[PDB]
Paper text:
The SARS-CoV-2 spike protein is the top target for antibody therapeutics. It is a homotrimer on the virus surface, consisting of three copies of the receptor-binding S1 subunit and a trimeric membrane-fusion S2 stalk. During viral entry, the receptor-binding domain (RBD) in S1 binds to its host receptor ACE2 on the cell surface, the spike protein is cleaved by host proteases at the S1/S2 boundary, and S2 undergoes a dramatic structural change to fuse the viral and host membranes. In this study, we discovered a novel nanobody, named Nanosota-9, from an alpaca immunized with the Omicron BA.5 spike protein.
While three Nanosota-9 molecules bind to each trimeric spike (which has three RBDs), their distribution is asymmetrical: two of the three Nanosota-9 molecules crosslink two RBDs, connecting one standing-up RBD with one lying-down RBD. (A) Two Nanosota-9 molecules crosslink two RBDs together. The 2:2 binding mode creates three interfaces: a major interface between Nanosota-9 and the RBM of one RBD, a minor interface between Nanosota-9 and the core of another RBD, and an additional interface between the two Nanosota-9 molecules. The major interface between Nanosota-9 and the RBM buries 835 Å2 of surface area and is dominated by strong hydrophobic stacking interactions. The minor interface involves the RBD core, burying 237 Å2 primarily through hydrogen bonds. Additionally, the interface between two Nanosota-9 molecules buries 196 Å2, featuring fewer interactions than the other two interfaces. Collectively, these three interfaces stabilize the Nanosota-9/spike complex by locking one RBD in the "lying-down" position and the other in the "standing-up" position, rendering both RBDs’ ACE2-binding sites inaccessible. Sequence alignment of the RBDs from BA.5, XBB.1.5, and JN.1 revealed three mutations in residues that interact directly with Nanosota-9: 478, 480, and 486. However, these residues all interact through their main-chain functional groups, so side-chain changes likely have little effect on the binding of Nanosota-9. Comparison of the epitopes of Nanosota-9 to those of Nanosota-2, -3, and -4 reveals that the Nanosota-9 epitopes overlap with but also differ from those of Nanosota-2 and -3, which explains why only Nanosota-9, but not the other nanobodies, can crosslink the RBDs.
Residue numbers in the entry:
A (entry chain A): 323 to 525
B (entry chain B): 326 to 525
C (entry chain E), D (entry chain D): 1 to 129
Write the structure that this text describes.
Amino acid sequence: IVRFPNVTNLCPFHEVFNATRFASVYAWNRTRISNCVADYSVLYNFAPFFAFKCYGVSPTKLNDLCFTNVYADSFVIKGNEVSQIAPGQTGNIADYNYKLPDDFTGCVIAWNSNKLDSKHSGNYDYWYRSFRKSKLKPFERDISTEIYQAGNKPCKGKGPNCYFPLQSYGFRPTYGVGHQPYRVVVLSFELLHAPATVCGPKK
Amino acid sequence: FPNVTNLCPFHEVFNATRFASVYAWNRTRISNCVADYSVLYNFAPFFAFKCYGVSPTKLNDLCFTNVYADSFVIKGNEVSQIAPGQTGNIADYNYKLPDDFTGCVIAWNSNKLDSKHSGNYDYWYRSFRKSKLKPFERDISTEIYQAGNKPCKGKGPNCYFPLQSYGFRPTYGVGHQPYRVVVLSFELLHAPATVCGPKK
Amino acid sequence: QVQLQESGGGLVQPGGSLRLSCTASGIALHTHATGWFRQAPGKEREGVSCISSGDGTTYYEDSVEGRFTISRDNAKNTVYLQMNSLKLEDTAVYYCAADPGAVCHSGSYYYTDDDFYYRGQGTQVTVSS
Amino acid sequence: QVQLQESGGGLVQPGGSLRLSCTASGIALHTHATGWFRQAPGKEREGVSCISSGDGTTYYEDSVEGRFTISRDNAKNTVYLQMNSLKLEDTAVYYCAADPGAVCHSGSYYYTDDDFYYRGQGTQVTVSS
C-alpha cells in the first residue's frame, strides 16, 4: 500500500519556465517550490530543448520517485557558454557567475530564446560579471558593483586600469548560434536524505 | 645542487655594432645553454613585441630544444610584413615565415645608430626576382633580371640590378627610418628538450 | 561614463605613415570588440578595421587591405592603427568605437552595420601638398 | 655601372615647347625616385621637379612652378620634362639624379639638400629671340 498526504496545487513550474523576462546571470533569480505536486510533464511540452542533462536521476524516473527542498533558478547566457553549466567545468561563467558543486543532484534545461531576448541594434539588458578578486564558492550570488582594480595604483574612479566588472552580452538577431541567447533553468534537489515535502502523482 | 651557468649569448646578438641586410640576414643558433628571458626587457623602449603560439610571461616555465635567432633592419613602413601570412616586397622576395610558425618577433628603432647625414648607403634589399620564395631561404646571388621579351646580356635598359640601397637620413619620417628586426623561431623535435629556464 | 579618446593625425605627405591611438577609461579593450570608421566630407561613414574580443581576428575593408595594420596593447589598454602608404583620397576624420562581445562577423552579421555602443570624438587626418 | 643619359636642348624661343628626356639604363624608375636640377651661369644650382616612387607626387618650387609639367612612362623607362610657355631667364644646363626610395619631401627632408646619388651628365638648353 502507498499513502501520500493531502495536496492542493500543481507547483509553479509553468510560471517560471514561461515568464516575460528572466534575470541576469550575476543576479540569477532563485525560487522555492514546496507543498504541491511536482509533475514533470509540463516541462516536456514546452520547447525542442537544446540541453536536458540530469545528474543522479533518470529523466523518465522523475515522476515515480520523490524528494524534498527543490530549488529552481533561472538565467540567460551566451550560446557557447551552455556547456559550462555542469559540475567540474571552468570558464568565465563557471568561475565568476554561477558554480555547481561536484556532487550535484538535479537537472539542467536550456532552450533558444532569440525571438524574444534580442532586439535590432543591440539588446543591452542582459549583463554578466567578468572581473572578480577570486573564484565563486558553489551556489553563491555576487550582486556587488564596485570598481575592480587590475593595476598597482589604487583605483578611485574609472581609469586605464579601473574597470567596471559588469559587461553586457549584446544580443542581436543576425548572430550565429554560438552567440545567440539561451534561457537556462537549473533544478536542484536532495534525494532520500530528509522527510519529503513534495512528491507528485498521488494514489 | 647544480648552479645555473651558460646563460646563452642573447646579449651578443641584441647588442651589436651593426646588423646585416635583409637579403643576407645572419642567423645564429642558441643551444646547450639556459635561456633567461629577462635580459630582453631591459634593452630599449621596444616598438613591437607581437607573436603567436606562446605567451610572453610564460616563456620561463616551459622548454624547447633548438631556438634560432636572426637579425636584419627594414624600412619603417614595412615592419608589418614580418609575420605569417602576408605578402609584399620583403614577404615574397626576401624573407618569408611559415604559416605555422612558433616564435617571437621583436623590432625597435635605430635612427640614431644606422643613419647619418647625406645618406647611409650600406644596407640593401632585393627588388626583383622571377618567382616567390619558400620559407626560410637566403638568396645571396647577384644576377641580372629580365622583365621584357628581349634578353638583356651584360648591362642595359630593361634589365635591372636586383639590389637597391635604402637611403637612411635622420630627417626622414617614421615609416622610412631604420627598424632593427629580430625574430626567434622556437622549435621542438626528435632531439630531447635541452634549453630551459632557471628556477629557485 | 566610459569614454574613448583618440590621438594622432597631422600633416602627413603621400607615401608617409601615421599611428592612430584610441585609449579607454572604464572598459578593457581585451573583452570588448574595437573598430575604426571614417568620414570624408560629403560622404557616408564606412568602416576601416576591427579586432574581436579574445586573441583577435583582424578584419579589413577592401579599400585599405594590405596597407593598414590594427593591433592592441593590453598593458596601456589602447588600440593602435598603423597606417602605411597613405594616398591623397584617404583624408577623413577617424572614429574609434567599442561594443561588448565578439561583435565583428558573428553569423550573418558584420561590423559595417554601424551600431556600436561606445564611441568617441574623432581626430582629423589630412594628406596633400 | 649605372648611367643617366639626357636628351633634348636646342635653340628655342619664348613661348615655345620642348620635351627634355633623360633615360635610365641601369636602375629602374618605378622603384627609384628621380628629379630635375639646373644651374644657371654665375648662380648656384636649384632644383626643378621630382617624382616619388611609382605613384607620382610632383613637387615644384615657387620660382619654377606654373610652367613645368613633369611626367614619366614605365614602358620606355624614360622620364619626361615637358616645357610649356618658357621665359627668357630659363637658359641653363639641366641635370637629373635619382635616389632610391620615395626620397623627395618625405618628412622634414625635401630634395633641396642636393645629397643625390646617380648623378647625370647634362644637356644645355638655351632660349633667346
